[PDB]
Amino acid sequence: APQTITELCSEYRNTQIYTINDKILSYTESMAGKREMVIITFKSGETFQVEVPGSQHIDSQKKAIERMKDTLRITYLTETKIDKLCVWNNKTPNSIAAISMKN
Amino acid sequence: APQTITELCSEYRNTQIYTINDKILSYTESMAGKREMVIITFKSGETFQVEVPGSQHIDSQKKAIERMKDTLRITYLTETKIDKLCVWNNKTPNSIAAISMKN
Amino acid sequence: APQTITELCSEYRNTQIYTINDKILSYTESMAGKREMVIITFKSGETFQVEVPGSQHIDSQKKAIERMKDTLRITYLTETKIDKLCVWNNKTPNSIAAISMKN
Amino acid sequence: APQTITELCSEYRNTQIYTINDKILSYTESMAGKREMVIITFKSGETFQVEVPGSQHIDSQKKAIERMKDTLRITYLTETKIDKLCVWNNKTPNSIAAISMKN
Amino acid sequence: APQTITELCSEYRNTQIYTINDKILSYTESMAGKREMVIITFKSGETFQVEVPGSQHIDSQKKAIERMKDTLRITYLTETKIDKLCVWNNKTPNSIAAISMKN
Amino acid sequence: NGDRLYRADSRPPDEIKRSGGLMPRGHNEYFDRGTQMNINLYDHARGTQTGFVRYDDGYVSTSLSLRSAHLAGQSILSGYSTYYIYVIATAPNMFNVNDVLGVYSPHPYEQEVSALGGIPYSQIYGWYRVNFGVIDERLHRNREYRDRYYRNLNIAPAEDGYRLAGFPPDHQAWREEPWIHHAPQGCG
Amino acid sequence: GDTCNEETQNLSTIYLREYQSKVKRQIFSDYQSEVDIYNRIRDEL
Ligand SMILES: OC[C@H]1O[C@@H](O)[C@H](O)[C@@H](O)[C@H]1O
Ligand SMILES: OC[C@H]1O[C@@H](O)[C@H](O)[C@@H](O)[C@H]1O
Ligand SMILES: OC[C@H]1O[C@@H](O)[C@H](O)[C@@H](O)[C@H]1O
Ligand SMILES: OC[C@H]1O[C@@H](O)[C@H](O)[C@@H](O)[C@H]1O
Ligand SMILES: OC[C@H]1O[C@@H](O)[C@H](O)[C@@H](O)[C@H]1O
Hints:
The complex is a heteroheptamer, with five copies of chain A (about 100 residues), one copy of chain F (about 190 residues) and one copy of chain G (about 45 residues).
Chain A: H1 5-9, E1 15-22, E2 26-32, E3 35-41, E4 47-50, H2 59-77, E5 82-88, E6 94-102
Parallel strand pairs in A: 4-6
Antiparallel strand pairs in A: 1-5, 2-3, 3-4, 5-6
Chain F: E1 4-9, H1 13-19, E2 21-22, H2 41-46, E3 59-62, H3 66-76, E4 82-89, E5 94-96, H4 97-101, E6 113-116, E7 119-120, E8 124-131, E9 134-135, E10 140-141, H5 147-151, H6 158-162
Antiparallel strand pairs in F: 1-4, 2-7, 3-6, 4-8, 5-6, 8-9, 8-10
Chain G: H1 2-27, H2 37-41
PDB class: enterotoxin
Keywords: enterotoxin
Assembly: heptameric
């Protein structure tokens, strides 16, 4: 399997690593129909989303999407720094595929 | 997808943005039949609910109703300031569609 | 929908409000068969239970029963003050219908 | 229906109440096939397990087994003191049926 | 049942005990298709993964894979020292079978 | 040094509990960001308040021994019938004042260790009540102290403290070692 | 020179907000409640 976020991110098409190394500035969570999602922003201006579950997601991802939204909530609340993000860059806002934290 | 809670809130009828900028004053949780809901209030006296799942909810919203209840509990307990609420205002108390908070 | 715990409690028969205004003194959890439940006790001598799921519970109550026990475990562990309880009084110990926390 | 852990532990055969009055010394969690269990120990030398779900558990207990393993992970991490354990003494290590925490 | 992680670990082919006695240095979580996994590293350079659910996992392990990821995320955030890991070494990075912590 | 630090203070346990810990002057809640506070080590080490062991300009001063803190409290909180001496664990929010400010240390002989931003309540091991200047030596332990977390932590190293020393822009300290190698922009 | 002093200010505040994150990771984590993801999803998506 991959050993680092950078190794996992380049086996996918349309991805890229953003090195953030900062805490989340804002967290938005929606339960509105068809927009059940989380949006996060950084001081630097980047906006990223966890996508609404949909046809493009395999069954194993539907479970990992809910885990990701839980990680982002408690990461935001405790102000833990995110080190890097791997995002699919063909979505607006760009879409989170993987996160790492360090220290 | 929308990038801010204001943009998201605008896609729906009967909604409104509230600028709260305060922590939750009280959290009520109920497991009584047909009132399985959460109510939160602010020092201002504004009161909001997470609705009972019903016919007006599509399937994808049911796991998001559960997540929103989890987010309001931990936001109350940690005394985290809520920034804005997107609510449906054809409901008493008004019901949360989306929440945002800023550090 | 009800705006306070007093108002919600009143829509049910065999309920009563207890103004606690205190932290839980003890938490008991069982996974013994037919006794899957929680019992909490306060300084004042009052004892309350979350009931075992049974025939009295309509299916919307089942996720709510699990939430109430998650809330009570957190409240106990962190010594969070409970303000009022709405309980059914035709059960020994009385069953928690709803809980409110303030500040 | 029971008022206390000792009244509850009384309803089952092959149980015992251990008064621990200490916090957990170690926590082991396993995801190995047929060994999906949690083992906790105390400074006094006693070792307890939450058993793997087998044939002896009825279905109501399936959720209860997961909650108990949740309680034991967070009791360890908050260094919370355990008062009493009701255990089945016909299993090695003895098997937890209920826990009591106080204060 | 086993009483220690070393007992339980010695019941499997391709396992090995590592004594870490340290806190997690970095935590990576992925929701990318077929790599829905958690990867952790320590200051001494060791990397371990919780692997993707697969045909090698029996049904009782499916909920145990998810509890292991919840444990790693919360002990990464609390900077809790991990005492030992039992890992399958026929996987790269080594795959976590069990974890123990003590203070 | 032994892992506990000491501070005499007239503010009682439950107020400290409401403030979220031992706060510097004019800061009311530990996590409050809106009450923007001046934080400057140099100005903190040189200041004196009446009826408070040094707690201005963003730091809260502590001592290495129960005896020093008691001496401090007797000189400064003397009129009070009851004051407390808080027992605090070492952690990297604490800086050794003589080590960071070096020869420019104002009051070397006091040997203060100062907490940047105040001392969170979970970092307070316990307290002793002092009644009419007499220490009741029965320690009351703090229920919310995080034993495991604070167990093994230490003071911040002086290194980390040099760029926060706070000397004025004209102070020759910014022109000599070791501060020169850590001077903030516009200092020197 | 203001720049010295507001730099001092700004670096001390950074240092403080980061120590406040270590404390929040300690006290806020006692409120984290874990979700059974399989039963949450077990109705759809
Ligand atoms: O797994 C989720 C991903 O699926 C891809 O098919 C899509 O191009 C990405 O934008 C993202 O949605
Ligand atoms: O989806 C939830 C929402 O559905 C709308 O149709 C309804 O008018 C709102 O009040 C709210 O219940
Ligand atoms: O919904 C749960 C409640 O259901 C009622 O039928 C019963 O009288 C109450 O005591 C309680 O069990
Ligand atoms: O519910 C679990 C319990 O079931 C009993 O019948 C068994 O004798 C105990 O050892 C324990 O497994
Ligand atoms: O069930 C988990 C384990 O299954 C084994 O068969 C495999 O060899 C291990 O590497 C691990 O995947």
